[PDB]
Amino acid sequence: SPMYSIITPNILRLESEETMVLEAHDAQGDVPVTVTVHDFPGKKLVLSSEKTVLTPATNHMGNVTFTIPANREFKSEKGRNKFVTVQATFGTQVVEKVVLVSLQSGYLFIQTDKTIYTPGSTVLYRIFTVNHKLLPVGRTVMVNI
Amino acid sequence: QMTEDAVDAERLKHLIVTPSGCGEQNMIGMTPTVIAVHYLDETEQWEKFGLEKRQGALELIKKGYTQQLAFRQPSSAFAAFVKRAPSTWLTAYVVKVFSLAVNLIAIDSQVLCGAVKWLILEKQKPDGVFQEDAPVIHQEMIGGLRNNNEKDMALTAFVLISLQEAKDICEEQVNSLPGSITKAGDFLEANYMNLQRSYTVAIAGYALAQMGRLKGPLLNKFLTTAKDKNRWEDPGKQLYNVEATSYALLALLQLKDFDFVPPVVRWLNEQRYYGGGYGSTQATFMVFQALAQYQKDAPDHQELNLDVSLQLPSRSSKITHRIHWESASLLRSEETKE
C-alpha cells in the first residue's frame, strides 16, 4: 500500500513563502494532490489552495510553495495562539495537520547615524525591512521613538 | 471585567461518545460530542486538550450524520424507527442539534427546512400551541418536560426555541415561520402569570427573550422566581433545574443584561456539572451552550474607546485621539511650545 506523506515547517509564517514536501511512497502512476490550508477552529474559509501532480519520474515527490495571507482579522485577537489546518488530498485520500502560525513577516534592522546624541541635534536613522529570506520587501511599519 | 473561569479542557474528555443505535440512542451518542466540540471551539481550549482529537470528533459526529438520515421519515419527519409515528419533540430536537452543527460542517439544508416545514404544517395550531402525541420510547432525553405540571408551556417554548435558531438558514425556504413564531409568542405572553414552576418560567423567558418583546410584568416575574438571585430551582431532579438555569442564563445573555448573569455564573460553576450520565442529554447540551454563549459575550465586544479631542488656542485645529482597546495607540504625548 502507498503511504502519502506531507512535510511542512513546524510553525508557519504569515505573508511568507512557505514550502511543503509532498510524497507518495510505493505509489503507481500520477497522483494528483490538492493542498488547502484553512483556519483551524472554524474551517469555513480557505486561506490558500494549490494543486500539484505527482509523477513517477521524480519517484512521486513534489514540493508545493504558497504564501499564506495575513487577512480575515484572525491576528486582531491576542488571546492564546493561532493555528491553521492543512489538508492535502492525495487523489481522494486526505491527510491533515494542524500547524501553528507565527505573527512574523521578516526582520527590521534599525541603524542610527551615531550612538550618543547631543540634545537639540537630529537623529538620522535607517530602517532596513527584510523578509525571512533576508531580501527586500515593501511593507508598512510603525516607528516609535 | 473580561476575566472569568471556564470549564477546564482536561475535565471534559469523557463526552467523546461514538453514536450508535436507533433514532434516539444515536441522538444520545450525538449530543455531548457535538456540544463538546462546540464549547471547545468557542472557548479556544484546544491547546491544553490535544489538537488532533479535534479531527476525531469531526468524523464522529459524521458517524451520526450518515445514520440519522437513514432514520429520517420520507414525510420530512424524524422518529425512532421508519415505521414509528413521528414526534414533535424528536423532530424539534433533531433540528436543534443540526442547526447548531452547521457552524462547523454543513452538508444538506433541505432536511432542516423540510423538518421545520413539517412542524409548522402538521403540529402548529392557529392558537399558537404545539402539542406532543408522545411516541418517544426513551424518556431520558426529554428532561424537565418529562414530569412537569405545565407541559404545554415548556413544550411549545422548546419548539419555539428549536424553530428560532434554524430561522436564519430557513428564512428564504420557509415563509410561514415568522407567523408561527408570532402565534407562539402570542400564546406565551398570555399565561405567563399562571406559571408556578420555575423551569417553565425559565424556558418561557428564554423563548420570549429571543429577538422580541417581554413586558415589565414578564421580566419581573422572570427575575423574581430566581431563588437567592442565582438559581431557578424546582422540586424534582437536579438536572432539570440545571437546564432551567442554563435557559435562564441564555435569556439573560440575550437581553444584554450583565447584572443578573454573574450570580448564575458562580452557581453554575459551583455545581461542577461536566455532563454525561443517565438521562442527561438536555442538561449537557444547555450547560455548554450557556457557557459557550458566555465565552462569546464575556468581553461582550466592549472595546473601550475614548475619543478625546484637545483644542488649543495656539493652533487652528482641534486634534482628536481615539483610544481603543487595540494596543497600537494606548498612550500618546503631545508637545506644546506655548
Q: Is A133 exposed, middle or buried (0-12, 13-18, 19+ CB in 10 A)?
A: exposed
DSSP structure class, residue A57:
G
Q: Which three cell numbers stand for residue B278?
A: 443517565
Query: What is the rounded CA–CA span in Å between residue B287 and residue B300?
Result: 19
For the sheet with A3-7, list strands across it.
A3-7, A17-25, A61-67
Measured between beta carbons, the chain A residues lying within 8 angstroms of B326 are: 76
DSSP structure class, residue B128:
S
CA nearest neighbour of A50 among A17, A13, A82 = A17
Query: What is the rounded CA–CA span in Å between residue B217 and residue B331?
Result: 47
Three-point CA angle B18, B20, B21, nearest 5°: 160
B52 reaches A (C-beta below 8 A)? yes
Q: What are phi and psi of A48, to 5 degrees?
A: -150, 160
Query: What is the rounded CA–CA span in Å between residue B134 and residue B157?
Result: 17
Query: What is the rounded CA–CA span in Å between residue B323 and residue B329?
Result: 6
| Count of helices and strands (H, E) across chain A | 0, 10
Q: Across the strands, what pairs with A65?
A: A19
Q: Across the strands, what pairs with A31?
A: A54
Furthest-apart CA atoms within chain A: distance in Å: 75
Cell numbers 511650545 correspond to what residue? B337
Name the 3-class secondary structure at B143: helix
Task: Give how far B332 is from chain A: nearest CA, Å.
Answer: 11
Q: Are B242 and B248 spatial neighbours (Cβ–Cβ below 8 Å)?
A: no
User: Which of B3, B37, B51 would best serve as a mutation to test chain A binding (most A beta carbons within 10 A)?
Assistant: B51
Q: Could you say which of A41, A76, A80 has the minimum Cβ distance to residue B41?
A: A41
A15: left (phi over 0), alpha (psi -120 to 50) or beta: left
- Residue B332 CA: distances (Å) to CA of A145, B78, B101, B307, B335: 12, 62, 46, 13, 10
Cα B232 from chain centre: 17
- Are A41 and B51 an interchain contact pair (Cβ–Cβ within 8 Å)? no
Instruction: Count CB-CB contacts under 10 A for residue B319.
Output: 12
- Strand duo A11-13 + A93-102: pairing: parallel
Query: What is the rounded CA–CA span in Å between residue B97 and residue B80?
Result: 16
Q: Could you say which of A76, A80, A96 has the minimum Cβ distance to residue B47?
A: A80
User: Which of A39, A45, A76, A80 would best serve as a mutation to test chain B binding (most B beta carbons within 10 A)?
Assistant: A80
Q: What are phi and psi of B269, to 5 degrees?
A: -75, -30
Nearest CA in chain B to A80: B44
Q: What are phi and psi of B332, to 5 degrees?
A: -130, 150
Q: Across the strands, what pairs with A66?
A: A18
Q: Could you say which of A80, A96, A142 has the minimum Cβ distance to residue B44?
A: A80
Element (H, E) at A53: strand A46-54
> Residues with Cβ < 8 Å from B48, sequence gap 6 or more?
B8, B9, B10
